[PDB]
Coordinates of C-alpha atoms and ligand atoms in Angstrom, one line a residue:
X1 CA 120.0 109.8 105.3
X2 CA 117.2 109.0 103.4
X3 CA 115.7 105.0 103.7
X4 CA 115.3 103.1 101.0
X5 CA 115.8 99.9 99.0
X6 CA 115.6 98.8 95.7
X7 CA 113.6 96.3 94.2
X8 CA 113.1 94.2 91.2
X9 CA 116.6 93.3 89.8
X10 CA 117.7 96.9 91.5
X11 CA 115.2 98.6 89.5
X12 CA 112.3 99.9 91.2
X13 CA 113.5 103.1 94.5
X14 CA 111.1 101.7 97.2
X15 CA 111.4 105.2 99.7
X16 CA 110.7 103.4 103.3
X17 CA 110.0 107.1 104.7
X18 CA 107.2 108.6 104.1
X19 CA 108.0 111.7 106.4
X20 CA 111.3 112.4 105.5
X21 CA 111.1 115.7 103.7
X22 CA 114.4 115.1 101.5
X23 CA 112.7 111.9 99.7
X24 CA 112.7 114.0 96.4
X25 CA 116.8 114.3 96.2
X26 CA 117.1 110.5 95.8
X27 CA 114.0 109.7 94.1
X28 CA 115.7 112.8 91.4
X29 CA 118.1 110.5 90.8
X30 CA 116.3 107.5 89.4
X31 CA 113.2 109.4 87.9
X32 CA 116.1 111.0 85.6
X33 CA 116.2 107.2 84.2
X34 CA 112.5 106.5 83.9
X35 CA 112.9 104.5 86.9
X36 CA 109.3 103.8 88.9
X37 CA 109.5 104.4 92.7
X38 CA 106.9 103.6 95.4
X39 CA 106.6 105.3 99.0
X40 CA 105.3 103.3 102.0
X41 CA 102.9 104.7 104.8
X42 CA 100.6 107.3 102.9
X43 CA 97.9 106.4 104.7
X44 CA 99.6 106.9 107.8
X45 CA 99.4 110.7 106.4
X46 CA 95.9 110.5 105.1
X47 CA 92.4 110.3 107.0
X48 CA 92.2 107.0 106.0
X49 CA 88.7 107.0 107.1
X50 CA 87.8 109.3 104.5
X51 CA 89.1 106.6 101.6
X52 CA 86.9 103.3 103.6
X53 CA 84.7 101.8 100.9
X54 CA 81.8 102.3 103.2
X55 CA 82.5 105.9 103.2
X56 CA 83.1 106.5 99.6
X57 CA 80.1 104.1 98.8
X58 CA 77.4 105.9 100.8
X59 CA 78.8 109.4 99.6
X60 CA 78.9 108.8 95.9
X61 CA 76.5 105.8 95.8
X62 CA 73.8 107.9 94.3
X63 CA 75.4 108.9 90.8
X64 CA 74.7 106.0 88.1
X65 CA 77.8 104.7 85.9
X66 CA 78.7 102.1 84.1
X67 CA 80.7 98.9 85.8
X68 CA 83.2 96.6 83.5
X69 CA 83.5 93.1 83.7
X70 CA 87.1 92.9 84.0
X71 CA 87.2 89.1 82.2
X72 CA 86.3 90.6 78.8
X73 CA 85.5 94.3 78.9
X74 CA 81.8 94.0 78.4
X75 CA 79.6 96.5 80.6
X76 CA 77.8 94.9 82.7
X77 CA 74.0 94.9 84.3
X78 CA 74.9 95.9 88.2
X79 CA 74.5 99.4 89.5
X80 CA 77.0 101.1 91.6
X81 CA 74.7 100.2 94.4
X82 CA 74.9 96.2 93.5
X83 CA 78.9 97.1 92.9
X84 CA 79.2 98.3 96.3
X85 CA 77.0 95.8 97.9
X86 CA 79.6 93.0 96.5
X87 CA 82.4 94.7 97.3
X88 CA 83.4 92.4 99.8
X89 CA 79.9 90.1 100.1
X90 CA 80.8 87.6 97.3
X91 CA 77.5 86.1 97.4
X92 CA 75.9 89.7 96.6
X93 CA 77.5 89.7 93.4
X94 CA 81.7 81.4 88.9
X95 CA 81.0 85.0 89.8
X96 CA 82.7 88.2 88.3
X97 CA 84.9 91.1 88.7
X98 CA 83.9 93.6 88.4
X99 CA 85.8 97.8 87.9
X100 CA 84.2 101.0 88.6
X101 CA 86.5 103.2 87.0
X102 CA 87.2 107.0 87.0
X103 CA 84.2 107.5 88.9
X104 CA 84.6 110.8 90.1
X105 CA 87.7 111.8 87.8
X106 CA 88.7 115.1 87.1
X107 CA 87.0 117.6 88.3
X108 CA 83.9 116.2 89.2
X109 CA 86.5 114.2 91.8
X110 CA 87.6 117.7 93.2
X111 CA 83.8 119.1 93.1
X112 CA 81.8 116.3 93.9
X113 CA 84.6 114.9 96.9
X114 CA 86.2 117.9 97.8
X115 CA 87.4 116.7 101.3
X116 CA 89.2 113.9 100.0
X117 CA 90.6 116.1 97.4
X118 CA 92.3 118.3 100.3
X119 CA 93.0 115.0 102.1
X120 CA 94.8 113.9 98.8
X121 CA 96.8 117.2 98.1
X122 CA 98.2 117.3 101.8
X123 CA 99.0 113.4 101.6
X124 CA 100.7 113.2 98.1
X125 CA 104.2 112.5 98.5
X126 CA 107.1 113.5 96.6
X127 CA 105.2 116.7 97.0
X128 CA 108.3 118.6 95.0
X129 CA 107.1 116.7 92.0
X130 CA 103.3 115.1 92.6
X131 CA 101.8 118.4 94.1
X132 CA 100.5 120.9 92.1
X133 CA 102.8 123.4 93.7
X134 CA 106.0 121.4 93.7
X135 CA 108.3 123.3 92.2
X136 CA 109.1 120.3 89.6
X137 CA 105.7 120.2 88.6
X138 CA 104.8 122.0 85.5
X139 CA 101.3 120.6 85.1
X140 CA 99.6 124.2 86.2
X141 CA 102.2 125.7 84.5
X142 CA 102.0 124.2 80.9
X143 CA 99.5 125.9 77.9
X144 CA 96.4 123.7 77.9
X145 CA 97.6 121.8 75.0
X146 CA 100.2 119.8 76.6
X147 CA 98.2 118.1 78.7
X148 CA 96.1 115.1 78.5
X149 CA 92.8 115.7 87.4
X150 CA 92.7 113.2 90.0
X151 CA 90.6 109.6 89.4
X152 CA 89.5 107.4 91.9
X153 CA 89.4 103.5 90.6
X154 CA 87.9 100.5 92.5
X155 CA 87.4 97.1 91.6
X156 CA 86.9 93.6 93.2
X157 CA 90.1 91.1 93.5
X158 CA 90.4 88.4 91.2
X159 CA 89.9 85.7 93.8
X160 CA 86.9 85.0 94.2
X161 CA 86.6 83.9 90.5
X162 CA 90.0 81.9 90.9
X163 CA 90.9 83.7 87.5
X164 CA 94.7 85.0 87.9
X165 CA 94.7 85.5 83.8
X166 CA 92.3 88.7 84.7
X167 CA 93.5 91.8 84.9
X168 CA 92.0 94.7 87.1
X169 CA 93.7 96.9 85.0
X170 CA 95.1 95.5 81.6
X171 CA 98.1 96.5 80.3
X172 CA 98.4 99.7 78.5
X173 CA 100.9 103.4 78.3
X174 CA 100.5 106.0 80.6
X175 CA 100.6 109.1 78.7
X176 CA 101.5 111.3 81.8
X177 CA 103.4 111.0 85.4
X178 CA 101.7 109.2 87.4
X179 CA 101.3 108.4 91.4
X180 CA 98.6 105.7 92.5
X181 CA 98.2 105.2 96.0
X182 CA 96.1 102.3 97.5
X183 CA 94.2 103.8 99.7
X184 CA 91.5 100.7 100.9
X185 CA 91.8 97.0 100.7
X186 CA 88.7 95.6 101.5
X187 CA 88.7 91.4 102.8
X188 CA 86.0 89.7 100.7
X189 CA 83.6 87.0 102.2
X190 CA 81.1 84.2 101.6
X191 CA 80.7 81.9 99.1
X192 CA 83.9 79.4 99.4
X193 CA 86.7 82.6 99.1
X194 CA 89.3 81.9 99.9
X195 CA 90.4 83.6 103.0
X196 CA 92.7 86.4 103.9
X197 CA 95.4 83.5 105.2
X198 CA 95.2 81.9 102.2
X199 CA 95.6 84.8 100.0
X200 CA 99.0 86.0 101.5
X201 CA 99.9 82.3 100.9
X202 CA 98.8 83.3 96.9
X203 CA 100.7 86.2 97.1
X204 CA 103.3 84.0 98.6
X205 CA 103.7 82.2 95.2
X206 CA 104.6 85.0 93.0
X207 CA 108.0 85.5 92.1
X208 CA 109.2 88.7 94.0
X209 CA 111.6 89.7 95.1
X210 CA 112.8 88.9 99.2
X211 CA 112.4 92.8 100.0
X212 CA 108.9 92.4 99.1
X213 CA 109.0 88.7 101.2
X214 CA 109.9 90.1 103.9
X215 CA 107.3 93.3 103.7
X216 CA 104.9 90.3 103.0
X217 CA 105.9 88.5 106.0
X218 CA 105.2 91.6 107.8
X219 CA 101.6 91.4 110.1
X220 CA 101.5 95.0 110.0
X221 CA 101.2 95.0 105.7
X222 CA 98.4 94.5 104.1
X223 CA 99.1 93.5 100.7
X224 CA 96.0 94.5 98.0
X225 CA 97.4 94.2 94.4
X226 CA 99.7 92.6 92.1
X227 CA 101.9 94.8 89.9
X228 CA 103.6 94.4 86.7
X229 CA 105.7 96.9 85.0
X230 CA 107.1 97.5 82.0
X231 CA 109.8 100.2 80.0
X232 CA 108.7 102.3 77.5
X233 CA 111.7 101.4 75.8
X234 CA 110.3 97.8 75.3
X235 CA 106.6 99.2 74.3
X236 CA 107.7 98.2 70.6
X237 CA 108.9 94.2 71.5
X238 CA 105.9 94.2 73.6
X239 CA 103.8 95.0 71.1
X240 CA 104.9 92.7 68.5
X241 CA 104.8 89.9 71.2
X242 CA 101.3 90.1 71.8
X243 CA 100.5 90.8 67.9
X244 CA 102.3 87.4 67.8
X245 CA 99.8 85.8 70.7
X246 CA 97.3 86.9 69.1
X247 CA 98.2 85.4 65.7
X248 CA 98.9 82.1 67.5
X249 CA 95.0 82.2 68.8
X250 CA 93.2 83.4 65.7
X251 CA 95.6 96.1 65.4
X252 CA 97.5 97.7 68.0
X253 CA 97.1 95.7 71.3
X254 CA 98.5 98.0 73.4
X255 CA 96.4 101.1 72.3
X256 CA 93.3 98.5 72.5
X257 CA 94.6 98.1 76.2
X258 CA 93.0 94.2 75.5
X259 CA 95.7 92.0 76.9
X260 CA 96.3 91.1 80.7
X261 CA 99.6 88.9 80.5
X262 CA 99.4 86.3 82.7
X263 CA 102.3 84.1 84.1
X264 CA 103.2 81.8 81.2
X265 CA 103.1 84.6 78.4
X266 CA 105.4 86.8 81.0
X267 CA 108.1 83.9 80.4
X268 CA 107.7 83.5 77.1
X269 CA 107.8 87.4 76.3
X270 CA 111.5 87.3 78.4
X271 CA 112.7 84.0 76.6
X272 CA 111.7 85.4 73.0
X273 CA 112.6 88.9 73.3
X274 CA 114.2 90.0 76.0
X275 CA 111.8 91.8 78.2
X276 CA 112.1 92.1 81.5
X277 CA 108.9 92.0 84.3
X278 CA 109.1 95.0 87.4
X279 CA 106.8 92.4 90.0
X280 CA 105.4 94.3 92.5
X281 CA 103.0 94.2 95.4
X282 CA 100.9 97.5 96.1
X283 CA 100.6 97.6 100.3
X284 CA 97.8 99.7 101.5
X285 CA 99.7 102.9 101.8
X286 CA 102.0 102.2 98.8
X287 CA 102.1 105.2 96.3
X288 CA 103.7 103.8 93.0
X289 CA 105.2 106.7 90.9
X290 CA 105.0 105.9 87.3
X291 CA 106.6 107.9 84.2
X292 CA 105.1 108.8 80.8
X293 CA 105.6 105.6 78.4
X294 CA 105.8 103.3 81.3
X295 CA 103.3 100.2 80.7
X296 CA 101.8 98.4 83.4
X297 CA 99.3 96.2 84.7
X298 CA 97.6 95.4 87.8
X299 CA 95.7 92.7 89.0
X300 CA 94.0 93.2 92.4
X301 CA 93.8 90.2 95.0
X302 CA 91.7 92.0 97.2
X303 CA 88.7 94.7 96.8
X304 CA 90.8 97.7 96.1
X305 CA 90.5 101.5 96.0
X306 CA 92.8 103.1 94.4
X307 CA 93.5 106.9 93.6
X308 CA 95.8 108.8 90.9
X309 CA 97.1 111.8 91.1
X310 CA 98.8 113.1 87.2
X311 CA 101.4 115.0 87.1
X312 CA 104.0 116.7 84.8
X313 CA 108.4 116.4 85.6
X314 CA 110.5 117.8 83.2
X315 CA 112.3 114.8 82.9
X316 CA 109.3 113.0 80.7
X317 CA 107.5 116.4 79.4
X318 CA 108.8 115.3 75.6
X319 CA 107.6 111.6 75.9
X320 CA 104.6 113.3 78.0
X321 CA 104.0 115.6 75.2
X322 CA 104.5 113.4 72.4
X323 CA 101.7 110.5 74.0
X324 CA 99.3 113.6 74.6
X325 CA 99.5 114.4 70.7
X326 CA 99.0 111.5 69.8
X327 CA 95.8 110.6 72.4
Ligands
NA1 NA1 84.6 114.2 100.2

């Protein structure tokens, strides 16, 4: 047998096994639908060391780039060093969040962190589809023109700033297959945060949900993120939903990737079209598998590191293909 459960209105394959080697027959099943999955315990495979923010800080500290305010998408004045130095000292850092995104991506990520980039190949799961060598993957098989590497993303939680309408990452379409694994949750202190306890309590008061309740409930989780998902069937009701926000407060909002929707629009975009919220929590460990056209958000809690890894099924190559085009 292969354990699992699903989540979200039946919706979402959570694969409770990361070692069982057959995960890809089920997970087959509901990626034919455009169904997301997410698979527990990756960092029970990976040298979890290897992905600690002191690590990753100290290795790559030395390369300059540019950090977002998460609140309004303006770069901001810190360094990477005064990034990493806030990562989880609050009082290094109302006080912001800040992203440090796609730094190494690509490439430069297999180049410039080649260990990790090993440790990320042998850890990937789903391997049959999310390795480069699975034998459902056709992203090394493909002419260069179908095709949009790896990128590592890390960003402080939200609570500090006691701001749940930012997002870490705003919603917006993934133009390829996608796995992103959490692979560090960092506790922030200082300056009045509010405390680990207290944050599971926040988590607490989200509408998930009781399989993720009771994984919550769990002393042995440690929750990072908040996820929201969306079909790429809805991306056209979504789309005119936030045109119509936006008209309310005085132009494509999804390509502008502008909008975190926060609790209250949620609601309203179910009541007045229809569409349906996937509410997820992203455990360190948790790899969520998204496809092409999905739409999500995410809006850490918690400092988090996360790394994703494209890839290419058949089962979304045309929507893939067609999103590439038009990129
Ligand atoms: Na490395």
């Amino acid at each position: 047998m292969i354990p699992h459960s699903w989540i979200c209105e039946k919706h979402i394959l959570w694969l409770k096994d990361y070692k069982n080697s057959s995960n890809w027959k089920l997970f087959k099943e509901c990626w034919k639908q455009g169904q997301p999955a997410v698979v527990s315990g990756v960092h029970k495979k990976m040298n979890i060391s290897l992905w600690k923010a002191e690590s990753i800080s100290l290795d790559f500290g030395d390369h300059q780039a540019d950090l977002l305010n998460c609140k309004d998408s303006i770069i901001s004045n810190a360094n990477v060093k005064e990034f990493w130095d806030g990562f989880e000292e609050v009082s290094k850092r109302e006080t912001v969040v800040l992203k440090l995104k796609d730094w190494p991506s690509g490439e430069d990520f297999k180049t410039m962190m080649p260990a990790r980039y090993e440790d990320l190949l042998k850890s990937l799961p789903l391997p049959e589809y999310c390795n480069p060598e699975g034998k459902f993957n056709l992203a090394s098989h493909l002419p260069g023109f179908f095709v949009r590497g790896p990128r590592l993303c890390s960003a402080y939680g939200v609570v500090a700033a006691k701001d749940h309408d930012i997002g870490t990452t705003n919603l917006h379409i993934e133009v390829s297959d996608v796995v992103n694994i959490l692979v560090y949750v960092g506790i922030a202190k200082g300056n009045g945060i509010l405390s680990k306890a207290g944050i599971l309590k926040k988590f607490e008061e989200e509408d998930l949900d009781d399989i993720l309740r009771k994984r919550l409930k769990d002393s042995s989780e440690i929750p990072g993120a908040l996820w929201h998902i969306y079909a790429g069937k809805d991306v056209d009701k979504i789309r005119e939903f936030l045109q119509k926000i936006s008209k309310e407060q005085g132009h494509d909002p999804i390509r502008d990737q502008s909008w975190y929707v926060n609790k209250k629009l949620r609601q309203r975009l179910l009541e007045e079209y229809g569409v349906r919220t996937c509410t997820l929590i992203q455990f360190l460990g948790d790899a969520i598998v998204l496809p092409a056209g999905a739409l999500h958000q995410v809006q850490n809690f918690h400092s988090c590191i996360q790394v994703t890894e494209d890839f290419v099924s058949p089962e979304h190559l045309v929507e893939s293909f067609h999103l590439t085009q038009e990129l």
